[PDB]
Amino acid sequence: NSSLWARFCEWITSTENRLYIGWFGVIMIPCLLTATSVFIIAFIAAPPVDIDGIREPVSGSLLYGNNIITGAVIPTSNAIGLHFYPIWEAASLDEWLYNGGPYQLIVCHFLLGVYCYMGREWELSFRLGMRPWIAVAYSAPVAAASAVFLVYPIGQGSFSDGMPLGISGTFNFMIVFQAEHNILMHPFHMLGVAGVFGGSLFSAMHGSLVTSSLIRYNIVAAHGYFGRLIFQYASFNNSRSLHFFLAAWPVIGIWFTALGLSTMAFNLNGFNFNQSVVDSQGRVLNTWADIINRANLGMEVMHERNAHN
């Protein structure tokens, strides 16, 4: 009880700290702290990186003429591919900067930190008597982040295909998908959009009804309003089922969209309705899918450099 190990265990496991630590805490704290430190330093004063591996460096640091919107941390070089490139493997620190190691450092440490945050959620929930199913809800954003940052590069074969840590980087990321894989027509992205929009709708409407009902009745009063507003009597008359539905809709939507991105990593595709309507004599009549395909074709042609010096 008084052993140094016992004292350390009690301190780590104590719930009287302002922020609970736990063992998942002891793992995640250094990881996330290193990630954020390196992220800030690279965002502020990082030198150019050759993302494409054709000796055409891309500047993304603030000191090199950039704003908040246009700045980012460029992913690793295409030459490294999917290899492991730690700091002590590069010939010199300058070469390490030129190739783009800090992206790998950030992504690895951040992924470990988020997983251990997931674990710590359950740990604290268990230390207090709560039920343990908040980690399941948190799995959706964690799954999406893991997909985008780790599974897509593995499928494509290089870390240069990951999402740059920025804003304009994210926009370029989205545009390159819409050029290459036709994400907009993939059913899983449709389910993700539906999940997000339905979550916003349900949040707004639940807030409205609950605030209206609360008078200086919480569910038996507003239910009369809802049953006659848009019909649909006796749908969610149990206060627990309603909140479970709220927790379930967006989580399932995000799970499906993450699985869709993971499947695209192995490159099946979105839907493809090109030239799906033809009259007699074999002539082709254009549909909206053809206009979308023209936009995608222009996008893809613009992206590819092909002639690289």
Partner: peptide
């Protein structure tokens, strides 16, 4: 049928 059965319960009550 569920909706019509519950509407009457809601109605004539408040």
């Amino acid at each position: 049928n569920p909706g019509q059965q519950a509407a009457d319960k809601i109605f004539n009550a408040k």
